[PDB]
Amino acid sequence: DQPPKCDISGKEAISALSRAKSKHCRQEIGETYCRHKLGLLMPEKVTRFCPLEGKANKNVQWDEDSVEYMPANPVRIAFVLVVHGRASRQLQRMFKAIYHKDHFYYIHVDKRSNYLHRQVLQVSRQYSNVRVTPWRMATIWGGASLLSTYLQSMRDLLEMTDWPWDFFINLSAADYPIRTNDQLVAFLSRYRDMNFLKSHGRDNARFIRKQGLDRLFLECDAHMWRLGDRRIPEGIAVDGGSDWFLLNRRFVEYVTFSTDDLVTKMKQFYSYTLLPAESFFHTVLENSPHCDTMVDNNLRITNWNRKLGCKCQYKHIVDWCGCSPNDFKPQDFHRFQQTARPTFFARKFEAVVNQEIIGQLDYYLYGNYPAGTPGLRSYWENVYDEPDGIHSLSDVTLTLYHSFARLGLRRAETSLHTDGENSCRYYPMGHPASVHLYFLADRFQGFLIKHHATNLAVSKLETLETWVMPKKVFKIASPDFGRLQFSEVGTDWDAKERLFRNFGGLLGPMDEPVGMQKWGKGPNVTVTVIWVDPVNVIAATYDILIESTAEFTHYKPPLNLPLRPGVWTVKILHHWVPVAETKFLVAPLTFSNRQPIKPEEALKLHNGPLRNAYMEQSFQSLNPVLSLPINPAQVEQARRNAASTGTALEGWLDSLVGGMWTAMDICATGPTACPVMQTCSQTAWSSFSPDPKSELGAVKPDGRLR
Amino acid sequence: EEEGAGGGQG
Ligand SMILES: O=c1ccn([C@@H]2O[C@H](COP(=O)(O)OP(=O)(O)O[C@H]3OC[C@@H](O)[C@H](O)[C@H]3O)[C@@H](O)[C@H]2O)c(=O)[nH]1
Ligand SMILES: *[C@@H]1O[C@H](CO)[C@@H](O)[C@H](O)[C@H]1NC(C)=O
Ligand code: NA
């Protein structure tokens, strides 16, 4: 611990120093603060080179003719795809829609998203006009690194002499085209000296403050630390808006290689800025010699709905509140057919949220697939891949993925009816090889687990995939007609899209469950919620008001940890009248730090709360009124269960899992000795079955893949 | 709606 180079008195810097974890990060915080304190970090005045008195906004005549013609000198486009996460099959579908042999594709995958990177590598190895960035940054939301990514990729693309591109377009894995490639090329060939950037469209002083442009930030330890105030440089006009844009090669060359006062000082200023790509390119362009080429239109449709998108949901990543646009739904299709202004792309789309709208758009642009094409209403998304290691899972998911595989092996044994040797009996081996989410018609169907096991009849290793689906537990007790439509317990509630991102509702003893209710239209009402643990202990009780306009409600009761393992129940009443109920599972864990749990560990984790009570308030008075007697025998058995390990613990776990999950089917990836097991590639549900909408083949005569 | 993802200090 070395003292700083200057006295540090700013409250914001002190807070950051107290919260930072690495000493390298604390040192960089102190250096940045001290250099700014001496006035040596930020520029204070900048030269403006634009001859205009203000903005240009050169309009574009949006007639039907401007898009239908055939150009003699068509532009060639360089697409930069900035992607992260698990949605590789949707990214392949979108890549299919935008591909043409005359364009170029340069793909940056977040350094954290290793699964997606391996899938992207397969694409780049197939096509000569597709490349991946060798460098990979941890492009956190709102981070300064997103501008560093764009600027490095621009320098890279300019040095690739074998790629003669005319325009630069950036896209995410949640973007999609809303016009054909032919119409895009025709439009850009007509306006090839223009730049397309969209401004905020409001009070400019309010934009600066809302964006935090007058505050100093530092990106370190995958976090944006706020370090204090700063002045907007004098002599230039500051503007901003959307960081999705289209820029021509001439302007990208200026941004990259110019050494004049404007470009130099702006690259320094924006190295310490939040959401830098949302104002850097606006500010440079409007003050540069190229200011007369700006079109106040980014040719995008962004589905902003700040009533749902502004929840200050990134506080753990950045020292600021942010907003995000919503995902499109089927009712939004008509918005893509507007011709008030020219637009060629839209965002956001998410296949795990709603795939129907994606299909409607793709078929509308490029037509239906042939009759009999499989998998068009399905979606598969990988959530664990063996090369990433079991330490990238948690003790919870590792425990439950193991249990799901055993549930499949028991189904294989049961499905064969014979009086001789059972050629469908298996012994599990190793850890799961992969796990997929499975959707059909925008409805979650469960998990697909790929795993290895020994067929005991022939004593040979086989690779299988199991499909497990959760049992339906929501029950309406009303006989009479109220507003309640659904009730659910989970974690990682997404306030913008109104769903749990823990799709399987997988829970362990140290998790903090969230209760959600879904309501229909109607007058105000007040209801009672009750949480019941596996041995009929009442953990919490509270009342909630449902306003006439409320659509969803949720609450996370403060329950002391650890939770008693078993099947919990959540009940809703209306003045003591039953309304509805639902159940959820707190699973006992078989692993500790990815190793088999030990007796003292298990006893500590599976014997209920440490303080011997879920809350300070007690609800023993309600047990008789609700007919919830506590059986002294079941309590003692729960204590015996808490001390179990190994085989006894595995039987307890699988018994609970089997009561809340169903092994729907199991298939073999290769040859098998089980006579009743289908080959995975021949099923309709396996991740090995055909999925042509996301498969990439040879380039067609017209230069397309779709 | 308008553009710009910044939502203020909080
Ligand atoms: O952890 C992350 C987060 C984000 N990103 C990348 O950063 C870009 C924006 O991410 P998201 O689409 O998740 O962010 P939003 O949906 O909130 O977008 C919106 O708000 C943030 C702004 O930067 C976007 O320009 C705006 O459209 C994407 O290209 C994404 O791939 C990462 O690479 N890693
Ligand atoms: C909602 O409930 C009644 C419904 O008529 C209404 O009068 C009241 O003002 C609203 N708010 C409450 C009850 O808190
Ligand atoms: Na390639």
Author numbering:
A (entry chain A): 252 to 730, 733 to 959
B (entry chain B): 211 to 220
Sentences from the paper on this structure:
The first enzyme in the pathway, peptide O-xylosyltransferase (XT, EC 2.4.2.26), catalyzes the transfer of xylose from uridine diphosphate (UDP)-α-D-xylose onto serine and thus determines the site(s) of GAG attachment on the core protein. XT1 and XT2 are type II transmembrane proteins consisting of a short amino-terminal region facing the cytosol, a single transmembrane helix, a stem region required for Golgi localization (Schön et al., 2006), a catalytic GT-A domain (Lairson et al., 2008, Müller et al., 2006), and a unique C-terminal domain of unknown function, termed “Xylo_C” in the Pfam database (Finn et al., 2008). XT1 has a two-lobed structure, with one lobe comprising the catalytic GT-A domain and the other comprising the Xylo_C domain. To better understand the initial step of GAG biosynthesis, we have determined crystal structures of human XT1 complexed with UDP-xylose and various PG-derived acceptor peptides.
We also prepared a ternary complex of XT1 with the sugar donor, UDP-xylose, and an inactive bikunin-derived peptide in which the acceptor serine was replaced by alanine. The complex of XT1 with UDP-xylose was obtained with the inactive peptide 2, in which the acceptor serine is mutated to alanine. Electron density for the xylose group was visible and refinement yielded a 4C1 chair conformation for the xylose group. However, residual difference density around the xylose and β-phosphate group, and the high B factors of the xylose atoms, suggest a mixed population of conformations or partial hydrolysis of UDP-xylose. The xylose group forms polar contacts with D494 and E529, and apolar contacts with W392 and W495. Of particular note is the close contact between the xylose C5 atom and the side chain of W392, which likely prevents binding of larger hexose and hexosamine sugars. In the ternary complex, continuous electron density was observed for 9 of the 12 amino acid residues of peptide 2. The peptide is bound within a cleft delimited on one side by the disulfide-bonded hairpin formed by residues 555–575, and on the other side by a loop containing a short α helix, the last turn of which constricts the width of the cleft (XT1 residues K461 and Q462). It is noteworthy that all but one of the 11 hydrogen bonds between peptide 2 and the GT-A domain involve the peptide's main-chain carbonyl and amide groups, i.e., they are not sequence specific. The structure of the Michaelis-like ternary complex with UDP-xylose and peptide 2 suggests that XT1 follows a direct-displacement SN2-like mechanism, similarly to other inverting GTs with a GT-A fold (Lairson et al., 2008).
